[PDB]
Symmetry: D2
Subunit: 323 residues, 4 copies
């Protein structure tokens, strides 16, 4: 059916994501789990669940981590979808540049290892910062000669989940299933488009507050966790749902419209942007326009695009220094 | 309509179980989260999920843990179902006996706090060892004069998930949805009843191996996690499923048949046993007979019951020494 | 918990609607079936399905049909939602005016009988023409003093299913789950609002043809049945879907936004209109504005409203003359 | 990827069956509708429903009916599953043997026409009497040299629905999802095996009445319909559910255990029987034993098998005389 690989499976997001995929993957599928620590334990725990027709596979990377880990090279054979959720924490004395450099190098190494074996797979990038790790992944795919602009997806759906939760909390009992969220995936680059959902909106003063809340929502969860770090359970939810949209599209079981941080393929001045796309059997099938927006949303988007172009440049600069 | 409290919500089991309940609870429900550590973070993380009509509430207990925590007393008001997943799964320097006393203490304190506010709630006990913590819960409820034998459930379903997975792996493509598991919830007390499922079984030499594997399956996960972890994702799955049977039974939206470690209410010599029950609007509606078993299963059940009887006694003796 | 009565359960729409509700109603529900012909057969057939937790009740009306059948009086006790799918869709020698009088009288007798026993029930009117039968049901409720403007719903959702299918056929692979349809529920009164759905639209000349096909879609099925039949399976699908939104709303399992032909409660000059509402535990919880529309849609809506006004007036006249 | 054809789609079963298939078929499927009268009307009616990803096709046969209708020949191209729900009513003047001869000849002609174009399809026979029409379909497929014993299925699941409904009505609140029903599919040939379901059974007088009720349920509905004929809405339900098991099995999306009236392939003296099978990608994957039964069920099955053998011979004798 499909073979979905979670890369960083023993992680905060990767354990709960792996459980939701075990529950939701179509009968006949394989769930492949990789991590440099904890992967056997996760696979042994998930393998006890009574899901008939799901094969659980895993591989353990070396500690300390090696580039091009041969356990990952073997697990990556015959994978359709790679969900990259690997990451390392900022330790006391690590600068922001050090954190960026450490996680950028992990995304490069993992995409090189996986794509050298399964170059026609979809890559779903969760590892932050998405605005930068996506275009690092593209540069890495270009370097081996297998970049497919329709199969690289920056996972930005957690913004949509938040934007939806917050507007439904404000408009109860009027509910919507989703809110378009375009631009990028961090702070000022996040642009919720409430003007494109149905029904009367709260006053513009309230909308400024809600839109701001979407932009700083990650910091809201960092503060509430008081040292345990960023969102895990809501990112498992967003990641599992996004992965299941890809899977169903690859299997011919849906043609879903989603929001993701994607190669704009000449549709925009910005070469990567969170935008609406339809997914099909070959990955992205159609790039949709952003569509009509209010003057407030257009100003937010011009500001966002300026920062996204800097985020992308920072990714490509890192990728060309190392590759 | 229903308010479900997860007591121990920031734990390895608690966080994934809370995520599943957030996804699966009926529209109009409340999900109440309590922990002595990390409760605010978890609630903040889960509150960002776009599940319309689910209210997420939390309370943080004091550290160090205090008896009868007033933050719990407040959260416990209007709760229909308490899921007790708090506990200490392991601690270097502590034996099985030391951990029994620690987990017994936790269960007594939490059940007294919760039942003093919400005496008509259902109590689902996950905290190990279930064979002792369920009767400790019963002795606690009796001490405050509110014990309802139909509202106390020891959660033993993870044995059934394991028994189903291992027999489906053996018999594919012949699949069953469940396997009766009776007796108790640890090692020698687990008795899977493969004779009671449809279709031809493997040889008895193979069945002996499968039944043994169910009994020591927890140890298989501990070993895969290098002695430093235990089953968390498979217990979240079992816990969420069993909680949702209790929720739908309370709401009149199902009358499901489940296996749980319950008060036998005079239907067996052993006063608590993992047995088949039907759930309804008032908790347990019917206690079913174990049903026909082979001589091999009868021999395992006789051995198991002798152990469960000492496990119960040990739990009731702890409870009476401290109540 | 919920008791749903299908009134006209043995008809072409009533039999398939009853089947879908039997499959989809929440565990613990009752499905109550009534007809003047065939009800015992339909109830026996449905009662054999292995749906745990659903009770199937029926009653058989006398022939020839009487005002206020006592079988219906007894079945109507404890019913939360009445789905009125009774009627005469065609008869050789009868004009559209003749069919109006027949369907109008059937809706008056059935709404009086039901509401005399269960006045707090929601009333879902499927019987055509909806533009006239919905206000006739309102005048009948008023006549016994139990009219609740939040519990009467004219079922217009078939126009939405068609509008959605036709726009999804045109824009494949881009799929939307619904299209707003406002105004009324016949011919020129049906106003699809394609400007209110996501994603790029076909050119205005194409949207012209799709909007027109929605308006005459019912004739498309009548022609394909050689003049001897009409939409039954697609109405059963729409009927069952709309009923399930009312049921979940009443049980507090959803607060859905639906398009229905409803009493506008002073939110519009036109006293009944197909417009967006949110349903809750007491029926309509919120009446939403039509919202921003294109100059073409504004023009279609102005023509539609003029015709809906005449259709309402025609209904309220029938009800006051009888 | 699946193309399911309903042959008799404008009939009392075929209209409701086609609606349920339109709702339940996987996204990407095709629903093909054929009838000698009303098929354009049903197809126009179903084609207006807002189901994304389902293609609706139809063909209309000639009236009066002709053998090897060219419209069916074209519609049958690329079909994976043929659901045969055609039939003509007994009008006054017609004996019980005029009824049998006209329906048996319709089954023969339809199977000939469809299997000449799509010999590797599954054939699901709903047309009555199933005990005879199933073996007629088999003789027909043998004459053109394409009989696959694993791809011919007599649909007997309506007896399971009824056996399940009746025992659930009697045992409430104890629910089971299915009851084994073996033998054949009419009157005394129908043998519900209540000894093989979980939980305590009602007393023998209650069981006797329920077993009898399953046997005469077809007649209970004919009487209630008081001249409108046999079951339609509950046969649409059973037929849709059966078709959906066959569909998922062909697509690799399930390996369901079902009860159907099938070629026993040397597993029983009786050459066609309602028995348990597992379905997979090539139709019947495994034929299971009837399993252990009580002396009363063994007495009922022995009588049943005597009459099923005569019903088979009645079909074969008809087919060999016309083939
Ligand atoms: N896209 C989003 O919306 C979003 C939101 C939340 C967090 N995230 C990002 O997801 C990533 C993971 O977050 P987390 O909380 O789960 O972290 P975590 O530290 O809990 O988990 C990361 C996991 O990756 C593993 N890992 C490290 N290097 C690896 C390698 N070379 N190969 C394989 N596995 C390796 C670690 O062992 C660990 O199990 C971070 O970059 C985080 O910022 C993204
Ligand atoms: N089949 C089963 O029933 C089964 C299987 C696995 C584990 N368990 C049991 O589940 C329990 C939890 O396991 P885990 O892996 O999630 O452990 P964990 O340590 O990861 O989480 C337990 C949580 O309980 C909290 N807690 C401790 N004392 C508390 C108190 N007084 N009030 C509130 N919260 C308190 C802790 O802070 C922690 O967040 C253990 O007892 C374990 O043995 C049961
Ligand atoms: N979009 C819509 O709302 C829509 C679309 C299609 C059809 N309809 C309307 O639905 C109605 C039913 O259409 P149909 O094709 O099912 O017709 P039908 O003739 O097949 O069924 C109508 C049923 O109503 C019953 N009935 C008549 N008078 C009754 C009474 N006094 N009490 C109880 N039952 C009574 C009949 O016995 C029959 O079973 C018609 O008015 C049709 O115009 C509405
Ligand atoms: N297997 C079971 O459990 C079971 C139960 C109920 C009824 N049945 C059988 O199902 C069959 C259909 O019953 P029904 O109530 O829908 O009958 P129906 O008369 O209402 O419909 C039968 C349809 O078959 C069509 N038809 C006739 N000849 C045809 C041909 N050559 N090609 C294509 N279509 C043709 C007719 O035009 C009609 O639309 C009957 O044999 C009935 O006895 C089976």
């Amino acid at each position: 059916m499909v073979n979905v690989a979670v890369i960083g499976a023993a992680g905060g997001i990767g354990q709960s994501l792996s459980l939701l995929l075990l529950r939701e993957l179509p009968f006949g599928s394989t769930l492949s789990l990789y991590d440099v620590v904890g992967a056997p334990g996760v696979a042994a725990d998930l393998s006890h669940i009574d899901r008939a027709g799901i094969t659980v596979k895993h591989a353990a990377g070396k500690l300390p981590p090696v580039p091009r880990d041969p356990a990952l090279t073997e697990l990556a054979e015959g994978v359709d979808v790679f969900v990259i959720v690997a990451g390392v924490p900022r330790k006391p004395g690590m600068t922001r540049d050090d954190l960026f450099n450490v996680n950028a190098g992990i995304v490069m190494d993992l995409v090189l290892t996986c794509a050298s074996v399964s170059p026609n797979a979809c890559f779903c990038i969760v590892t932050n910062p998405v605005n930068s790790t996506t275009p690092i992944a593209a540069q890495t795919l270009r370097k081996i000669g297998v970049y497919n602009k329709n199969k690289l997806l920056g996972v930005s759906l957690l913004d949509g989940l938040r934007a939806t939760r917050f507007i439904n909390n404000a408009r109860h009992p009027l509910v919507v299933p989703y809110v378009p969220v375009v631009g990028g995936h961090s702070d000022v680059t996040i642009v919720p488009l409430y003007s494109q959902i149905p029904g009367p909106l709260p006053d513009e003063s309230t909308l400024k507050e809600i839109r701001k809340r979407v932009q700083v929502a990650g910091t809201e969860v960092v503060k509430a966790k008081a040292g345990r770090g960023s969102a895990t359970l809501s990112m498992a939810e967003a990641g599992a749902r996004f992965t299941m949209h890809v899977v169903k599209a690859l299997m011919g079981l849906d043609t879903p419209m989603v929001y993701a941080y994607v190669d704009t393929d000449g549709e925009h001045e910005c070469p990567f942007l969170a935008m609406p796309v339809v997914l099909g059997k070959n990955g992205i099938e159609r790039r949709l326009p952003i569509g009509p927006i209010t003057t407030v949303e257009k100003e937010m988007l011009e500001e966002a695009v300026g920062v996204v172009k800097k985020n992308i440049a920072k990714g490509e600069t890192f990728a060309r220094s190392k590759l």
